[PDB]
Amino acid sequence: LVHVASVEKGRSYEDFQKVYNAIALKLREDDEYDNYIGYGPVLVRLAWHTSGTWDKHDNTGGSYGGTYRFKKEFNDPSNAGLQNGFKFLEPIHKEFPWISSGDLFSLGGVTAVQEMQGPKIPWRCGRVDTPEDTTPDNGRLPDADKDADYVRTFFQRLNMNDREVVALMGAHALGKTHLKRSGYEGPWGAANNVFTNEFYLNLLNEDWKLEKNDANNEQWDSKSGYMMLPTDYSLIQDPKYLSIVKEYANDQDKFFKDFSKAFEKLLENGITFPKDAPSPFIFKTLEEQGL
Numbered sequence: 001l002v003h004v005a006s007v008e009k010g011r012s013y014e015d016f017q018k019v020y021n022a023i024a025l026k027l028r029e030d031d032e033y034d035n036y037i038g039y040g041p042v043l044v045r046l047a048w049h050t051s052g053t054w055d056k057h058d059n060t061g062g063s064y065g066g067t068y069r070f071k072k073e074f075n076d077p078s079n080a081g082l083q084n085g086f087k088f089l090e091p092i093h094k095e096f097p098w099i100s101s102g103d104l105f106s107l108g109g110v111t112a113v114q115e116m117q118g119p120k121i122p123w124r125c126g127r128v129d130t131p132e133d134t135t136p137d138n139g140r141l142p143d144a145d146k147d148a149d150y151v152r153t154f155f156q157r158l159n160m161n162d163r164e165v166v167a168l169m170g171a172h173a174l175g176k177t178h179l180k181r182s183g184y185e186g187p188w189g190a191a192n193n194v195f196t197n198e199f200y201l202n203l204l205n206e207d208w209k210l211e212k213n214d215a216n217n218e219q220w221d222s223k224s225g226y227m228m229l230p231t232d233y234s235l236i237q238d239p240k241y242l243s244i245v246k247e248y249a250n251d252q253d254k255f256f257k258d259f260s261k262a263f264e265k266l267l268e269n270g271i272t273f274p275k276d277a278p279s280p281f282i283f284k285t286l287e288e289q290g291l
């Protein structure tokens, strides 16, 4: 199936900047969530999980249809906790009922990255809600207890190469693992609601110990109180990934640029943009607007 981007009728950049802004203002206001981490990280994860169901082989899943709103997908065990991001977005959707669900989930992630001082992420509108029976089955999102070969093979299905995978994984600077959600516990670093290249620096520079958590799963832990999943640690066990980790640990701008591209790509898999579609939008942050 072909999913053609269809601009919400009559809307243009200013309409979407208003949605951006409402998201950004609520991010600022609702600051208590998750022991004052705020909603930034879970909104980034929501954007990724709503996009990451995509299968390049048949164009099933992906961000276009906004299918997370249906119970099979919002109840995927892999999505445990993302209901917090959905509930955050609910008043946004009520204020702007014209935006599609896929456009809102993906825009939430863009807005979160940018408001957390991350790179600009160009964003295109035009996702169209699709019916309940187009919801992908559970099991398309990745396991965390696996090795580099797993990660590499997994991400081929999303048409991501080694550099794109290592870049995307840098989002694990953000937020934390929660035991009751994923069976893993702990943050990956100190700056977990500011978008930086800290994930790579911590992988290379902390002294990691392979421990079992209270859910009896193995994870890598440091004396600073940080953790890495087995799939995170695989990025320094595999020599191809390791080279790229070192690159991003040593060049914040390069990480920003490569993340931006990869994240936009992730959010746009499966969508066909007509030749006369609008160019991608680059939203101004609240700070840049003086708001």
Ligand code: HEM
Pocket: 041, 042, 044, 045, 048, 081, 142, 143, 144, 145, 151, 168, 169, 171, 172, 174, 175, 176, 177, 178, 179, 181, 182, 183, 184, 229, 231, 263
């Ligand atoms: C091999 C791939 C990946 C695996 C196995 C993985 C696994 C996980 C797990 C287990 C959690 C903790 C969930 C919890 O307990 O709350 C998590 C959190 C998170 N992941 Fe991933 N992840 C992967 C890729 C990505 C990518 C590609 C992004 C986005 C670009 C991403 C963004 C996030 C964010 C932002 C959080 C924190 C959520 C929060 O604090 O609520 N992850 N991931």
